Amino acid sequence: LDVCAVVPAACPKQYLSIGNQTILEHSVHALLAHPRVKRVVIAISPGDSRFAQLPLANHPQITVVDGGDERADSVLTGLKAAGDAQWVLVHDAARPCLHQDDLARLLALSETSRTGGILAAPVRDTMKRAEPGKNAIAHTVDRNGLWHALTPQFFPRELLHDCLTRALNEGATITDEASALEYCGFHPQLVEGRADNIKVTRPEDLALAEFYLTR
């Protein structure tokens, strides 16, 4: 039942701090919380100097690898260092607000499924599609069965390995890990997660993450 986590961490928002720790430390620590998660593999770009100065740089359950050209190389590098783990948990560096109950709910999949899946949250707003290249609404987009893709993303290590290898080599346009499976013809599951599992991308996200984390 052993699980390796992989964080593609590769002035970056994961090195911003909420209180005690960086966003990167919150995210990582939320994964290490769950007992099935034995190690966390963190991809870091070789330019990155901030990582080495954090306590996580010498934590015994963390391994660092050189991040690659794209998200997907990093993750493949991470998989290759997951040792002997059979399932693999991919998590964004900048998602520090993960709860243990979505995480446990996601981890339940290694016994119910052969594909794996992702945390996600149903879409609530009414969605519009712009006229291509324009300022103007073309039509309303149907939101039933529309989901926000979140992370962690939880998969059989070898399946992940195979879908990523093929999409990188065929030069497919990859966004999340789930999209690499999709590209190879798989259909990973949507596990409903809390909507407060946000990615800190803009200045004001930081205030929000902090709000969410203290709640």
What is the Cα–Cα distance from 200 to 118, expressed in whole angstroms? 18
- Using the contact rule CB under 8 A, the part of the chain among 14-22, 28-36, 100-108, 136-144 near a copy of itself is 136-144
Cβ nearer to a copy of itself, comparing 21 with 115? 115
State the minimum distance, in angstroms, from the CB of residue 149 to a copy of itself. Answer: 4
- Using the contact rule CB under 8 A, the part of the chain among 40-48, 51-59, 66-74, 199-207 near a copy of itself is 199-207
Judge whether 103 and 30 are in contact, CB under 8 Å: yes
Residues in the chain: 215
Q: Does 178 bind a copy of itself (CB under 8 A)?
A: yes
State the minimum distance, in angstroms, from the CB of residue 6 to a copy of itself. Answer: 17
Q: What is the DSSP letter of 175?
A: -
Exposure string for 99-130, b = 16+ CB within 10 A, e = fewer: beebbeebbebbeeeeebbbbbbeeeeeeeee
Q: CB under 5 to 8 A by kind: which of a copy of itself, Cl ion, none does 146 bind?
A: a copy of itself
- Using the contact rule CB under 5 A, the part of the chain among 75-83, 94-102, 159-167, 177-185 near Cl ion is 94-102
Q: Does 99 bind Cl ion (CB under 5 A)?
A: yes
What is the Cα–Cα distance from 24 to 16, expressed in whole angstroms? 8
- Using the contact rule CB under 8 A, the part of the chain among 24-32, 37-45, 78-86, 177-185 near a copy of itself is 177-185
Q: Does 203 bind a copy of itself (CB under 8 A)?
A: no
Q: What is the DSSP string of 66-113?
A: E--SSHHHHHHHHHHTSTT-SEEEE--TT-TT--HHHHHHHHGGGGT-
Question: Of 101, 111, 88, whose CA–CA distance to 192 is shortest?
Answer: 101
Cβ nearer to a copy of itself, comparing 38 with 186? 186
Question: Of 48, 159, 27, whose CA–CA distance to 95 is shortest?
Answer: 27
Cβ nearer to Cl ion, comparing 81 with 123? 123
Residues sharing a CB contact under 8 Å with residue 133, sequence separation 6 or more, in sequence order: none
Among 1, 33, 108, 130, binds a copy of itself (CB under 8 A): 130
Check the CA dihedral 46-48-49-51 and report its sign.
Answer: negative
Within 61-120, the residues that bind a copy of itself by CB under 8 A are: 115, 117-118, 120
| Contacting positions for a copy of itself (CB under 8 A) | 115, 117-118, 120, 123-132, 135-141, 145-150, 175-176, 178-179, 181-182, 187-190, 196, 199, 201, 204, 207-208, 211, 215
